[PDB]
Amino acid sequence: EYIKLKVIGQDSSEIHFKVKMTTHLKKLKESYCQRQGVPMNSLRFLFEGQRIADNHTPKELGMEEEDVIEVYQEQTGG
């Protein structure tokens, strides 16, 4: 039912997440943004190295338990 998603930020800010395999990852993104005070865009989440779709869900990633997700501050060239 619930999977362990380790959302580790880039400033030692770690948070444990419990998400259902039926619910989308869009709500997971909303939970982290409201509990961290950062616009939905500002960041970026990754898995298996590759980026994460906004409509994604373990339904597609087959993410087992204890999995990990990386978040990177969003940026662009100059």
Binding site: E14, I15, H16, K18, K20, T23, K27, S31, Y32
Partner: peptide
């Protein structure tokens, strides 16, 4: 609970 449900609670070391 009914539609969507996500529980988030960490613990510091």
């Amino acid at each position: 609970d009914n539609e969507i449900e996500v529980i988030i609670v960490w613990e510091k070391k």
